[PDB]
Design a protein around this ligand. Sequence first.
Ligand SMILES: Nc1ncnc2c1ncn2[C@@H]1O[C@H](COP(=O)(O)OP(=O)(O)O)[C@@H](O)[C@H]1O
Ligand SMILES: Nc1ncnc2c1ncn2[C@@H]1O[C@H](COP(=O)(O)OP(=O)(O)O)[C@@H](O)[C@H]1O
Lengths: 55, 55, 371, 185, 371
Amino acid sequence: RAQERLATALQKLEEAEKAADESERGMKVIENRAMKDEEKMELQEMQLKEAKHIA
Amino acid sequence: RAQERLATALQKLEEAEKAADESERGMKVIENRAMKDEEKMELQEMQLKEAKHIA
Amino acid sequence: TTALVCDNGSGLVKAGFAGDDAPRAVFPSIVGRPRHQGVMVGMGQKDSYVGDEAQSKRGILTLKYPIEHGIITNWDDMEKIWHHTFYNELRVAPEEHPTLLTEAPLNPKANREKMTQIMFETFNVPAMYVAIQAVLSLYASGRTTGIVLDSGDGVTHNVPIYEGYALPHAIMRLDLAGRDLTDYLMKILTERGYSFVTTAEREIVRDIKEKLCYVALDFENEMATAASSSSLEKSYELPDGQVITIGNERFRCPETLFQPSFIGMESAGIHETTYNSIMKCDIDIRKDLYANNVMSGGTTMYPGIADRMQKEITALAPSTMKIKIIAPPERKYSVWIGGSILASLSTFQQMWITKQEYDEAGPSIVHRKCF
Amino acid sequence: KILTERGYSFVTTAEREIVRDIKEKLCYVALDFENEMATAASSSSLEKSYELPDGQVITIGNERFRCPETLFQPSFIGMESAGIHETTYNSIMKCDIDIRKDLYANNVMSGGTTMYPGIADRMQKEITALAPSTMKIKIIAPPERKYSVWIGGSILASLSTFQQMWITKQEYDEAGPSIVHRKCF
Amino acid sequence: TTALVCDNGSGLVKAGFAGDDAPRAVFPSIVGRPRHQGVMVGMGQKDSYVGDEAQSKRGILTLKYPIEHGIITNWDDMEKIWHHTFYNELRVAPEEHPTLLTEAPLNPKANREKMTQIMFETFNVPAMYVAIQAVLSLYASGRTTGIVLDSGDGVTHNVPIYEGYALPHAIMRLDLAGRDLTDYLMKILTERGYSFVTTAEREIVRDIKEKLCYVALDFENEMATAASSSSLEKSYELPDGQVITIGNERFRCPETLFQPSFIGMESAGIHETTYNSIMKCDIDIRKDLYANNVMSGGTTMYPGIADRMQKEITALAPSTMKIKIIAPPERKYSVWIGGSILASLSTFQQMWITKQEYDEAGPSIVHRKCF
Ligand SMILES: Nc1ncnc2c1ncn2[C@@H]1O[C@H](COP(=O)(O)OP(=O)(O)O)[C@@H](O)[C@H]1O
Ligand SMILES: Nc1ncnc2c1ncn2[C@@H]1O[C@H](COP(=O)(O)OP(=O)(O)O)[C@@H](O)[C@H]1O
């Protein structure tokens, strides 16, 4: 049984590491999109201001 | 050594899962924020439009 | 005809029809009354709102949950709640519908009795029945053994069941639940400068708790971390702007469930009461109970609670025992789901309490095996 | 536990002492459980009040004899073993047959838990129902029995034929704590 | 050497040396600045008066209490206050004097932190310490148990203490105090035609309150009486003659403390928060707490407040409990007195926060048990 749960711990360990790797390049792309939303909100907020002023 | 490496696998699995899931909470909230900034851009470019209209 | 399944609880009323897959109507179990005088004649303001109506009119009301810790204190507000449920949320004449009702274990018998009496007199149901929330929660999980840890908004009980048999002497009720966590959060939120005192803004604090809080896998490490870095701070928008930020609080608040000393209580933590309830049962059924720790109720919906719970109860139990924690993703409604399942049986259709039988034997009938 | 079903909740280790006082004052054994249950159901001549350390008097009825009844029906607390009377009778029956009459006649009773109003009478009734009919059942229940252990201890220690059963410091130094199990008992 | 005891509070700063019997210097904690321009050259008018100087120059200034509800908001005015205290009210070099500071419970931790930091940097004390006003108020009354109801000018808290132990989970802070009563009096004084709007004449109203108001043992009877007769009207002469009269107001104003609804607040009255704080405490210590309701702070100096308070809290408590209200005749300074007592101890002389220790550990040291 030691060999059994060793093998299980091993495999499940690496697959959960791979799942974390999926979630973490996902977190990389989502923080990239976070900065995307930062710059988009910045630009659009600026143009909102100039719109209000000109109006 | 089976049980010691098994304990290593357990703690690693667990902390990696918690990291994956906190990044998952982060991805939830950033998808939310992304849609948020999306409709933000929509409405504020729109008020820019009507500002240009009446301008 | 179909039966109704109204799970009162504190904080949230959950009603629906037996056999459905989820409670149809869900609304906060509060009653509000205006606390100013009103000046616009012809507005015809009613005198007491209820449910989501009150939750929306919060700004000018004073809200009062009519259930404190599983027990019903204001009976008139409770009757208002029930009447509003039946006639607006479900829009159903309760005269031709057996209704299922739930209550925590170890409650004042007068509570259950008066519940039965009001049900049969005011609303005049054809039949009714009162069930233990934890048994229903086990039903909804497809199990037949295992201890269940329900933790709603007012109370928190453990019920060990094995092969459908309950061990009553090992039931552990504990009066620490979501309302207490909300209050402790209101308290520790002062030390940043935020002051919520009104019964209205207690709801704001409840929302903050449901959104930002989480359980820490290791309290000391998270404390030291939040001290060093600032990667734990998150912001929040109040109903009038003025975004606020909370750090340490996010995991200090629900930590109470494991260290009740934070709010001055003396009883042991959640993991401790669970383990004790296990140890009270006979030795032959302890492995299965270790394997089948069900969890229900809205308070068990914190990000990370199952992992911390497993860690602790593993630290307490022997090493050669497999600890598992059954935490479904819809566990908030597990009690109502189990109630629907049970009421949908036919081997159950002879356990109801018939109006005639009540008229024959009085409210004392409930404690009898017409349970 | 059973005080909850009236609305009274004591959970603190402090107020466990309050509950112990309530038990020592109001509880009592009932000669016939079913009759007393039916009686408490019908009338209210059994309710007695009690003032807590902050006023707010409480009242208990059925509990007064539900609580100490456990000793005769341990199932109330989930234990499986037999009741007090039953274990007494069994202990009798395990003894040799020639000494059972005297044991029937000399049921001594001590300790503070045997200080309930009525416990001796119920005890006698039960153990009489178990034993044969031609045996005399008696129950020695002194009024100071709560201290009978200490009293007997003083009596024994005051003997002189006992002054050679002690365990001397020198002897223990010579033979280690294993000496106790030896006939230096 | 001697220790300093500065009890900031709102409304009134009171300072003195440890071991003394009463605070040497007592002056209003306000800062004034001229709001006109001034035309006489060579007059050399300074730019901001402080304390009694400002209270005398009221006519041409704009006064601004730098403490709102126990919390410090304008830190520069607070530093001005402290500096003026040390260098003019006491004529003492603060470099060689450990100072004792007070604050209400449940305050922003940043407040106390910045307090410590400024104390060690600007004034450069050798050591200091921050104490809870209510604990000191208990010290000054020779007690060691009993709940204390401090109510200064900005905040109002109850702190149940037993045998020298404090039960923090039962502390009840409430943000209704003398300033709010002053404002409510300013408001209801309009309905006689008297209009006070300036920050100067707010002080006039404060004096009117301190002189003519009182608590009514029974509100309805006193209302009906003032309606029928006129034996309750008393007059008062403003700083320019034009005597005024007030009737109903005399007891309508301080009644707020028992019916906070008068000013739109939702919390329960003073007696109610007291009784609730009692009930939150363990049952074994409730009789002593009932018997030792200490009071302090200037707001508890209304003629009749102790009798009304006893009446109410007796109506709430069981009948077989002895209610007593310890209301000394000097209770306004009980906090400072207790502070002097404590600072004068020697078993206390190792609880200070040494400047070396602070330099070693930074302002975060205060929350640490160097409390
Ligand atoms: N996502 C969440 N995280 C933490 N706590 C929650 C969450 N959702 C709800 N709660 C808490 O759970 C309570 C609802 O639990 P519920 O099962 O409805 O109680 P009851 O059974 O008494 O109705 C709410 O009062 C809320 O404070
Ligand atoms: N005789 C009195 N009657 C009623 N209220 C008073 C009286 N004297 C002072 N006060 C009020 O009490 C306040 C002073 O309380 P104090 O203990 O100085 O508060 P703090 O502790 O915040 O300095 C003043 O603002 C005043 O309004």
